[PDB]
Amino acid sequence: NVLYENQKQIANQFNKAISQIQESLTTTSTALGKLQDVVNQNAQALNTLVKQLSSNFGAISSVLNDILSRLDKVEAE
């Protein structure tokens, strides 16, 4: 009754607390998933950006060199 209800005290708490812990674990899992998704999207964005930039600098380089060569010749004649 007294020390039989002392074993019923432990049980009500441990049960309720496990309910809180289970919730904390799924919340943590959800937060980690949301971070993984954005981290990876932004990685992709950056890599796409580098591709396009590397293309554009190739073109710019080539055109600048051509212009410089053309202008050299036009100034030398």
Binding site: Q13, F14, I21, E23, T27, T30, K34, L35, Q52, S55
Partner: protein
């Protein structure tokens, strides 16, 4: 007659922002709520 340069348009490349504030806040709350999951053995 020189062709146009035609650089690629990069203005559609976008980085996303994350929103996990709900989760962060909830973790702090669950921590505070484990106070009344503590035993008083009497």
């Amino acid at each position: 007659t020189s062709p146009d340069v035609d650089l690629g348009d990069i203005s559609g490349i976008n980085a996303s922002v994350v929103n996990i504030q709900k989760e962060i806040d909830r973790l702090n709350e669950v921590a505070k709520n484990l106070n009344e999951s503590l035993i008083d053995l009497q």
